């Protein structure tokens, strides 16, 4: 299954929509620019399983995404452990543009 997460609400609010997604192994999450880019996707290394910098860095798209509808996707293969993964947008972290992926299993 593929879960689409909009970056930016239709109104311009700096939010991921939906902010919380639950996935199963093999599922994909696809972030897509919606309103008021640029956005990016940074996983907090203290807020992924094992507090792994490697894992957080692997999942992140640190490069700013400027283009309308620009997309980034992660397929959660077996090298992604069960647990919750919290991420944020660096441009809008202060404003609370934060999200969470829960990997079940
Ligand atoms: Cu943002």
From Swiss-Prot:
It comes from the Bacteria. GO terms for cellular component: plasma membrane-derived thylakoid membrane. Its cofactor is Cu(2+). It is a peripheral membrane protein. The keyword Thylakoid applies. Cu cation binds at residues 39, 89, 92, 97. Residues 1-105 form the Plastocyanin-like domain. It is found in: Cellular thylakoid membrane. Keywords: Copper, Electron transport, Membrane, Metal-binding, Signal, Thylakoid, Transport. One of its GO terms (molecular function) is electron transfer activity. The keyword Transport applies. Belongs to the plastocyanin family. Participates in electron transfer between P700 and the cytochrome b6-f complex in photosystem I. This is Plastocyanin. The chain holds residues 35 to 139 of 139 of the full protein.
